[PDB]
Design a protein around this ligand. Structure first.
Ligand code: FES
Length: 98
């Protein structure tokens, strides 16, 4: 499967659409497709890559920085998240945690 991923940057007011294989992390796919996103650790252990889900689901079992509560609130670490349905996500959300 290949899911459609819509990236929204609310502060600049941009929207980019990418197609992501089900076994590829969102970040990787964005980059290949021409869209640079913020990242540091690239390993699920920081908050740099944070986005917030608007709709759809992901699989981010490889993350380790977010707590249950944050994940439930919709936060996602884009560098370790596989889409598992079409997804609409707001990027550059790191500040939303502090
Ligand atoms: S780059 Fe650190 S959690 Fe994604």
């Amino acid at each position: 499967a290949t899911f459609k991923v819509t990236l929204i940057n609310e502060a600049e007011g941009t929207k980019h659409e990418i197609e992501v294989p089900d076994d590829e992390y969102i970040l990787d796919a964005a980059e290949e497709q021409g869209y640079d996103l913020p990242f540091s650790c690239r390993a699920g252990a920081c908050s740099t890559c944070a986005g917030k889900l608007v709709s759809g689901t992901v699989d981010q079992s490889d993350q380790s920085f977010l707590d249950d509560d944050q994940i439930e609130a919709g936060y996602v670490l884009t560098c370790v998240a596989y889409p598992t349905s079409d997804v609409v996500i707001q990027t550059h959300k790191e500040e939303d945690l502090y």
